[PDB]
Amino acid sequence: MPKPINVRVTTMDAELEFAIQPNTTGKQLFDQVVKTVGLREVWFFGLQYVDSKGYSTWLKLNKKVTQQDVKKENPLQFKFRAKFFPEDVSEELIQEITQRLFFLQVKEAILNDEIYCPPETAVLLASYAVQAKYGDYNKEIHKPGYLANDRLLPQRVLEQHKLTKEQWEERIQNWHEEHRGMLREDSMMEYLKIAQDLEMYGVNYFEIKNKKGTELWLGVDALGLNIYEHDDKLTPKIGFPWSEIRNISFNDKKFVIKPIDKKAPDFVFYAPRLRINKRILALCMGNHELYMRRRKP
Numbered sequence: 001m002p003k004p005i006n007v008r009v010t011t012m013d014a015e016l017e018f019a020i021q022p023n024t025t026g027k028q029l030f031d032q033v034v035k036t037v038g039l040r041e042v043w044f045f046g047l048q049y050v051d052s053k054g055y056s057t058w059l060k061l062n063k064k065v066t067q068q069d070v071k072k073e074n075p076l077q078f079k080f081r082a083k084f085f086p087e088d089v090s091e092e093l094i095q096e097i098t099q100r101l102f103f104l105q106v107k108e109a110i111l112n113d114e115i116y117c118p119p120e121t122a123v124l125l126a127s128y129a130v131q132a133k134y135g136d137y138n139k140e141i142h143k144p145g146y147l148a149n150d151r152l153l154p155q156r157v158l159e160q161h162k163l164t165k166e167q168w169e170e171r172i173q174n175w176h177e178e179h180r181g182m183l184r185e186d187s188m189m190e191y192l193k194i195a196q197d198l199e200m201y202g203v204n205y206f207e208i209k210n211k212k213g214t215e216l217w218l219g220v221d222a223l224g225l226n227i228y229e230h231d232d233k234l235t236p237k238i239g240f241p242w243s244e245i246r247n248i249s250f251n252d253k254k255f256v257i258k259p260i261d262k263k264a265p266d267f268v269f270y271a272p273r274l275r276i277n278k279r280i281l282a283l284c285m286g287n288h289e290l291y292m293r294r295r296k297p
């Protein structure tokens with residue numbers, strides 16, 4: 001009689017562990033996590049893991065987690081993260097819990113430079129993050145240098161020799177002071193409001209190439225498909241909202257965008273490995289279904 005498998009699921013700010021059955025499905029496991037967290041806006045999330053070959057991967061709901069080549073470790077390692085992003089944080093993130101998990105994930109991303117962010121904006125962001133952690137600024141508790149141990153800015157901004165840490169840190173203090181009567185909840189939501197407008201926010205980039213053989217970037221967001229030149233991942237060269245796409249399919253390393261736009265050329269591009277296009281497709285499918293449920297429903 002088969003022994004249970006140990007699994008470790010980690011949210012941005014929590015450690016969860018379960019004892020799964022040899023025949024448990026990704027869906028049943030997802031069900032457990034969500035029920036345990038009390039998350040309701042489930043359509044945004046999913047479970048992430050690394051496969052035996054080393055790649056990061058999204059867990060398939062409709063299968064036995066045991067049949068998904070997830071790198072064998074004692075407690076199996078899983079990461080609960082947001083897979084899809086809303087079009088407007090304010091209208092779609094209702095639960096206080098969902099709001100927090102998005103703030104925590106987006107912040108990390110900013111902090112790692114995964115999402116470009118102008119220095120002055122970065123400081124402005126950092127200030128809300130502290131109002132959320134340290135509450136209101138009290139001159140007696142929050143003595144100067146109360147942040148010198150915090151990770152607040154990306155390493156990219158600190159490289160601004162125009163100022164120094166303590167300088168940058170007091171810049172943030174100014175903005176912290178200005179946020180006095182602000183709730184924790186509200187501050188995290190302002191952070192999200194400011195970050196959702198950043199060009200690189202919510203877009204999944206993929207290294208691609210066209211007929212010509214030229215390097216190109218492919219972005220999949222909640223709103224459609226964007227093709228970026230190489231030196232610029234902020235501003236698209238050609239776009240394709242979900243309401244402008246008639247059909248998208250891939251051949252081996254062949255991707256065809258069929259535009260609803262009756263008298264417009266099909267856009268075609270080639271992606272490196274096959275398992276890549278496989279995932280690019282899954283995202284398109286997802287952001288598309290989420291795009292519809294926002295209108296037609």
Ligand SMILES: O=P(O)(O)O[C@@H]1[C@H](O)[C@H](O)[C@@H](OP(=O)(O)O)[C@H](OP(=O)(O)O)[C@H]1O
Nearest residue numbers: 058059060061062063278279280281282283
């Ligand atoms: O029939 P199953 O048990 O789902 O078997 C396949 C498995 O779930 C893959 O992970 C999935 O790729 P995605 O990650 O792109 O879903 C593939 O989809 P496909 O058949 O549409 O390639 C499925 O066929």
